[model samples]
Target chain A: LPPYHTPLPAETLRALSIPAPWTFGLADRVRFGELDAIGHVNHTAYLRWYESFRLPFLKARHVTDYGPTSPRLVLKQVHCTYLAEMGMGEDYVITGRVSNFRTTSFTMEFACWRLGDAVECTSEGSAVVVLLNRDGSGRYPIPEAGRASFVTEDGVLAA
Target chain B: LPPYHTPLPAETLRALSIPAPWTFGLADRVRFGELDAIGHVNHTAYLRWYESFRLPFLKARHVTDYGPTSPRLVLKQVHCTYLAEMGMGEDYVITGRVSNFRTTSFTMEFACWRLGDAVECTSEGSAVVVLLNRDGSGRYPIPEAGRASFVTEDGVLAA
Candidate 1:
């Protein structure tokens, strides 16, 4: 393929600041056209698995608590660190943990753990999110309770 | 699942800085788990897809690439913007373009497009790559041709 001509977008830069809390997993089975070439699930594919978990957590917990009249959140940024790889037809578990949370944004740590003792190969990552009104023009002030949800007795790590 | 406690590994940091090219039509589908109550592809998933594409690009192009030769590039940093939500069960094409190419690292402009549209949701990312021997101690320079392959005079973009 020929080389490309565009640059990474600035909107992406802003999104990288927040992180997601909570981790989840996906079972690896079929090596569809996308998963086959590498003989394993590719790195980006693994990170996507991690992201699959974020929305479910926040909506089910924080946002819903704001009552029926709550504003919505916008995901601002996402980053990942690849530690390992999972092969085609291999059974693997994709995991996620809340790295940090906040009123305006939150971050999460994610991992892809290969099956068996060879679990050394894992992928970790974080993301940032924003609170916005459903119409897309409205921005909501993060409730004090929302801001406080991310505050931990101990500070967050650099991950 | 709990949040990961570890900071990103140094390898991941280094990997994020390497310049990578994207494969056409390579976007992975967003799993059902990645969606929120809103039914849009969670923004965080973009970074995961970015991570998924990186190392494979290397191995796919060069037989000696990927692990066993040396660990494939790790995902260190990523910034993704959600321009649109990818729907479930629909086929999408993700094409990555080279944004920056340099000696120390590289950047990729990645996007998930609906089959007909040129752009749907896009992401731009960077990685620090170290070409090394299997034992991981030697520093191998990226082949002059390979490095140059990504640096097209007509298409180059800055990191």
Candidate 2:
């Protein structure tokens, strides 16, 4: 079994063009069921991995409380690139950083890596999520306190 | 229970910037199993709907012969946008079109829509697929015969 992995290096993230100050991460294992008809992990599975952790990461920072009545982030757009094939038996990690935070919307950068002898990224992507008001009126601005949580000195994840 | 539905209108497809002469489509229903905890269809489920049909659509066009050693279109990139939320009891259609073709790669555009009263669009997306050789050594160029099948005079799905 692959060992638990460390955060990817900053220089490596720069080379990959993934932004940083990665505030949160979630580890995942490749389930046999996640594999598609062709045997390798399906392309959609990567996004599921992101989904499985993103909200939890936000909660850890007190970004938003979970409930139907609470303000929520609605997915607006997603851009993903597949680099390497991830097969069964590979334990991987998904790390996310708030790349851009605006009043009504924010964007996040995510990377997935195989946790092993060498940390090999299998995929990298970004998503744009818009803040929706709880009342269903429309968009909402990011709160001041929540905005503070995302800031970093040089925009790199703290060690 | 919602009945399985059919394709979308040409105007709506054009409105969403989904290039057409849409030669193929696959119908799907928004299942209760597909919804996330928030009561909306999980974002990844749309891509799953895409996956469920894309390969079969390719086969209909003679683009791929499925097998481990068969030349396959490996997914390279995906860009998806959520236009509206889809929920349970709604029937939707996923339509696909081959938008662009290159020597070793092709682009496809897709749309999802609610099947009933308003026929609202739920999502739209595009994907880049690169042809891989049977031996997996490298990429393969698309055959001339397969290329001809994707062309249409009006750029709309045949009725």
Candidate 3:
């Protein structure tokens, strides 16, 4: 919460080889706490990376207000595919965006790029974000502003 | 690699109402480190819960030897569906199993049961565990012993 996320600059993106359609990303590390005894990045750490990218994306995209009496933003489902192993203290950039949105739920997609040479999507994942009413009811409408933000800013497709 | 995982006792299982097809599980808590600022569990914490239950299950099931030359165990994919929210310091029982196995990969399923009064799976998931050759090639065969262990011990449906 203490400014852990920063808008990736064009210079950093060019250096990291993070291309367009991934407009929002933050620089992070494979910390000691995120590893096992073998020091390789733990499997769950991928989910954490996806999640850590999600909050800033949501905040910047105006997906959720996060205030009391706001819609119940339930993470109905999440999935990650690990494509490569990461070394300890490795620097990585996590990028995220909304891929598709429905009447009630939208798909929030995330990917991790291995920085400093191996410039590829080392890992990628997505989550099903469903908004619920405050009174234990169902189906909250996604804000048009955020939908437009994603479409205009990140090239997210609406299906 | 401290002994962070333990065998769930019969009394513990009975108290938690964890029925069959879920033979391997551990008693874990919703620790502060695993929570978000709003006190609800973080989305990534579910992956950690799924992962923490996986190793002991694999060890008990003899799925992986985890030695220097053991098969390269790669977690290909992981997924979780959250049915409900959990509170801080709340007790939960995390359970896992092998739902099925192919020639080169197996499906490890996990579920989290709320320990008090709720008596049901609050969250559940599965991962694609792929075995690769030690020489950085592809497709390691599924261990026969672990396959039999799963079939006899946990009633996994082999395909």
Candidate 4:
């Protein structure tokens, strides 16, 4: 059995500035083209996997598409740690949890696990993303409504 | 003026397992298509930059392209720390250095700097790559010739 993962307590989550509950997830398969010469998925492919889910996660939280009136989110830092190797043709899922939110940016933690009888973590990572204006003139604020939506169904919040 | 970087001494370089002189480099530009909604280049783009150079770095070291008779290299871990945002249409360079060698794996450090002006760094990263057989059933050793070539022109050695 895959070890049980306890969700971070709301207070401890706040102290570390990590969003919990991992309410957002996306399932994907390893594509032949995504593998490197070694036959395992390339490291960069994981970033794309995060992105595929991130867009939807944002949309679900009421973050709109980029436009003159829309604010943009940009990554400031990212780190990935590989656990076990993932082979080609295997199915997997990527999940995201917001840990903390600041005036203009937030942090997201992610995990990728095999989608099979026995779940195993293949890779995990985190990224710090900043909110910015469309014109790149300055940092943009997360409106009250959007911030409110950051709450998970279980009640963790940006408050 | 930007501070000059003195090359690492041979003994210290070997002890720390970082290759010196960064003899192989790849030049590329930030494409508009590569930018995220925030207008700055996306973090994933930098990984591609490293990869754009990694292949040639291997080929230059006589690491043949993937085939039944060829051995393959796969990344085990990767990290990128963004120092500055890269704007669209900006040219940049990615340089690679082999830092350490193991029986079946090696580490490569990379830097991405603006192509012109002060040539300030926009981002930097490192990757751990393991060598495997084409059939993906076993790890492969670094042949003597490949190890010799991993040494930089400055006389840093795998010795």
Candidate 5:
């Protein structure tokens, strides 16, 4: 997993010429397997990166512990924009943040910015995650306490 | 390759309880590696399937021959909905169609429906593509003939 999936600094954030409102950031490099048959990073690779970066964001905000009692976060929908492309061995920081919340669902935004001479957005997206009961039987109500955590930690303004 | 990514018959198309307006379809089965850590099909797998299915559709429409002078089709944005989780070995049909067109861009929609006692939609999404000039200069205007092919073959209405 390389030496680490390090966290980004504040100045590093400002330098990225990408869409904003993202707070949680994790640095990672492109893997050889992530490329398509033609060698450019496959579109699917970006989603996998988002999934990896999103897990810790969800956990840090108590979205899930993935334990027996933890509610399952199911991705309902995603709208992603590919602004640029990245190559193998390139270092990029993936960023995510809770943007909105509902009784049982929350929305998160994501952006991948390459780290080089100029940090540019390679990809960005919005995902809707719905909490399912531990057994995955049905939707689980989001706790107001969890909402407070998202608001305080992610700075999401309540509607 | 499962013997074939077979073309669907007319009756098979009618039986799929998925979104309408798709003409090009290929049958495929879920693979072992496409599964996520939790054993469910990862979201990225669907995008890969879409990419696999989209290639021929573009070729059939003269979108590209992958020849040196063929214009490049780049995916600019996509919005996908994960309706249900698919398991390994399950047979499913992936469908695609050109849906709309502008002077320089067009949209394609995709749907995945499982084949069983009851045909059901497993996932669906839309992708926007822009054609690049053969020299990799910038946006290229979609030819009227190509637009006409999409309109007649895919039944897309001119806008």
Candidate 6:
């Protein structure tokens, strides 16, 4: 895949900062179904947490449905660094930053941290979210006119 | 692997149901974040949510630490399903259920669903958790008295 897969370096990636995307939003409460016998949250459960944060990030920016009417989006890739273990009763924050924005696709960086704490376990990844236009035997893009605010970091409209 | 590990029925895997472990938790909500271009919550943020849910579960059931002095608990595995794309403003529930319990370990299931009507996009999965007596050496059984409370089905703890 990449130069080296599995266990990609996180510190190096963390140093690269994309401008934080408009604050998407916030979520509350964690479910007990997320823990293990030792009473700690399991590792894979983090993926959901990251999404919980990413959901609001879209609303604040007005890119909710890709362009207008895509029923669902697909996950391309994810990168995360686990810092200190989060206890059961703590609150955290999710922030989004623009990673790569381009015509036809864009990626965003996401992170979470204990409220008031600098230590953060962050995820750096990209996603391809265009309107899932299904027009028989093929796929199509959202109407060009509908992509008003889907701008790229380079100031180009996400086609 | 298993005899069925062949080409690996990719579709079948999607239909596969791992044992659910959500019957034994009383969790709480700590924080929530926004959505991203991906449409639902960001993937990595799920970890923070799971952690927040766990603290209260342990306290409610009197689930204590590995021992008297150590404050850390180790998680062996966690699996999360990306069921549905969460909308920007939809109120979703991240829940945990404790399924089966034993002297040495227990299982838990985590899920995120809409607070109201449609809940199909809900994601679900489980993890195997054990009490670790040391950093990487000894993994002792869960406290003996608590073993009596181990919930079992068909005489087998869930996997």
Tell me the DockQ of each model, to 2 decimals. 0.32, 0.82, 0.70, 0.54, 0.84, 0.10
- Model 6's DockQ? 0.10
Q: What CA root-mean-square deviation does each model show from the true structure?
A: 14.3, 5.3, 4.3, 8.5, 2.8, 13.2
Ranking by lDDT: 5, 3, 2, 4, 1, 6
Model 1 C-alpha RMSD vs. true structure (Å) is: 14.3
**lDDT, candidate 6, B49-149, per-residue tens:** 55455655544444565356433454555555555555555544445556667655677666654444433435555555666566556766665434433
Which 10 consecutive residues of model 4 chain A have the lowest summed lDDT?
Answer: A1-10
lDDT of 1 by residue, B38-137 (tens): 7876655555555465555554434135446553343344556666556565444444555665654456666654443343334444454444455656
Model 2 chain B, TM? 0.80
TM-score for chain A of every candidate model?
0.60, 0.79, 0.87, 0.79, 0.86, 0.59
Ten residues in a row with the worst lDDT in model 6 chain A?
Answer: A1-10
Model 4 segments more than 4 A misplaced:
A1-21, A29-42, A59-70, A81-91, A100-102, A134-137, A141-159, B1-21, B29-42, B62-70, B84-89, B134-137, B145-159
How would you encode candidate 5's per-residue C-alpha lDDT over B116-144 as one tens digit per residue? Answer: 77778889988999898978688888766
lDDT of 1: 0.49
**CAPRI tier of model 4:** medium
lDDT of 2 by residue, A43-139 (tens): 9888877766677656654568777666767898887889999889887778787777867777877878676776788998889888888898998
Better of 4 and 6 by TM-score: 4
TM-score of chain B of each: 0.62, 0.80, 0.88, 0.80, 0.89, 0.59
Question: lDDT of each structure?
Answer: 0.49, 0.71, 0.78, 0.69, 0.80, 0.45
Please report the TM-score between candidate 4 and the true structure.
0.67
Angstrom error of the Cα, residue A89, model 3: value is 2.9
lDDT of 3 by residue, A1-159 (tens): 102368785456765678876777787778888887666888778877777777767778887777877677778999889888888887888888888887767888888887765687778898988888888877788788888887787776665
lDDT (tens digit, per residue) of candidate 6 on A82-148: 4456556554444454455444445655555444334344333233343334333334443343244
Candidate 2 clash figure, as a count? 4
DockQ of 1: 0.32
TM-score of chain A of 1: 0.60
State the lDDT of candidate 3 residue by residue for B62-110, as single tens digits: 7777787777777889989999888798777888878888787888888
lDDT of 2 by residue, B39-153 (tens): 8998888887886768777776667778666677789889889998877877766888777787777888887866676666788888988898888688887766567666652
TM-scores of all predicted structures? 0.51, 0.82, 0.83, 0.67, 0.91, 0.42
